[PDB]
Amino acid sequence: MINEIKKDAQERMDKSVEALKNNLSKVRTGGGGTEERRKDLVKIVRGEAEGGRVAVRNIARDAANDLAALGKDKEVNWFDISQALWEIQKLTDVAVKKIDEVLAAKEKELMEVLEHHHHH
Instruction: Report the largest interatomic distance among the alpha carbons of the chain, rounded to a whole angstrom.
Output: 68
Domain boundaries, the chain: 1-120
Residues 6+ apart with CB under 8 A from 17: 52, 56, 95, 98, 99, 102
Indicate the Cα dihedral angle 99, 61, 93, 49, nearest 10°.
Answer: 10
Q: Which of 20, 18, 13, 38 is nearest to 28 (CA)?
A: 38
Distance in angstroms (rounded) separating the CA atoms of residues 88 and 70: 15
DSSP H helices in 1-120: 2-25, 35-69, 78-111
Distance in angstroms (rounded) separating the CA atoms of residues 120 and 116: 12
CATH 1.10.132.20 holds for 1-120: yes
Q: Which of 37, 15, 12 is nearest to 27 (CA)?
A: 37
Q: Which of 107, 116, 16 is nearest to 60 (CA)?
A: 16
- CA R_g for the chain: 19
According to the entry, how was the structure determined?
A: X-ray
Distance in angstroms (rounded) separating the CA atoms of residues 80 and 67: 9
Sign of CA dihedral 88, 61, 19, 26: negative
- Resolution attained, angstroms: 2.0
Instruction: Read off the DSSP letter of residue 83.
Output: H
Per the document, the length of the chain is: 120
64 with 88: CB under 8 angstroms?
A: yes
